Amino acid sequence: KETAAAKFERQHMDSSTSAASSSNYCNQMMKSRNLTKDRCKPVNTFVHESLADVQAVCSQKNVACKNGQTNCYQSYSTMSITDCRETGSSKYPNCAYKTTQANKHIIVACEGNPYVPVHFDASV
């Protein structure tokens, strides 16, 4: 089955765009990345940086995840990200999202060897 590292990349990386180009970014991305397949994943962040820059956060500022785990890390730098949140009218299978662009630090949980992001915790 899909590794947690692969799933991170599928759910959160978007190195192909510098930012969200239209209000439909999230509708399109949530669907194309298979996040609406079974249910409407309620919230999702996409990171518009290279994979290596994102994987490098696993060696930046250690910080405790929302859930208390100590394998979280805050990027030293701000990063371009897109926040996706379901709209009030979102209804499976017709999942719909509000697209919000921003530049903020990211916090991810890392695991393995190589030690890579495996969960997106927050943007700050």
Q: What gap in Å lies between CA 30 and CA 36, rounded to an integer? A: 6
Number of domains composing the chain: 1
Q: What gap in Å lies between CA 43 and CA 23, rounded to an integer? A: 15
Preceding residues of all breaks in the chain (C to N beyond 2.5 angstroms)?
none
Q: What is residue 23's three-state secondary structure?
A: coil
Please name which of 98, 96, 97, 93 lies closest in space to residue 37, comparing C-alpha atoms: 93
Resolution in angstroms comes to 1.5
Radius of gyration over alpha carbons of the chain, in Å? 14
10 has binding-site annotation? yes
Cβ–Cβ under 8 Å, residues 119 and 108: yes
- Pairing verdict, β 72-74 and 79-86: unpaired
* Determination technique used: X-ray
1 has binding-site annotation? no
Cβ–Cβ under 8 Å, residues 101 and 73: no
SS3 letters for 101-115?
EEEECEEEEEECCCC
79 Cβ contact partners less than 8 Å away, ≥ 6 residues apart: 47, 48, 49, 53, 54, 103, 104, 105, 106
Asked whether the CA dihedral 80, 84, 15, 73 is positive or negative, the reply is: positive
Q: What is the CATH number of the domain that holds 41?
A: 3.10.130.10
85 has binding-site annotation? yes
Q: In sequence order, what are the beta bridge partners of 101? A: 82
Q: What gap in Å lies between CA 11 and CA 45, rounded to an integer? A: 8
Q: Phi-psi region for residue 43, left (φ > 0), alpha (ψ -120 to 50) or beta?
A: beta
Residues with a known catalytic role:
12, 119
37 has binding-site annotation? no
Q: What gap in Å lies between CA 53 and CA 106, rounded to an integer? A: 11
Peptide bond into 117 cis (omega under 30): no
CB-hemisphere CA count at 13 Å for 67?
Answer: 8
Q: How far is CA 1 from CA 5, 100, 113, 122, in A?
A: 11, 32, 18, 25
Distance of alpha carbon 14 from its chain centroid, rounded? 9
* Residue with tokens 């692969």, as numbered in its chain: 6
- List the domain range (segments joined by +) for residue 109: 1-124
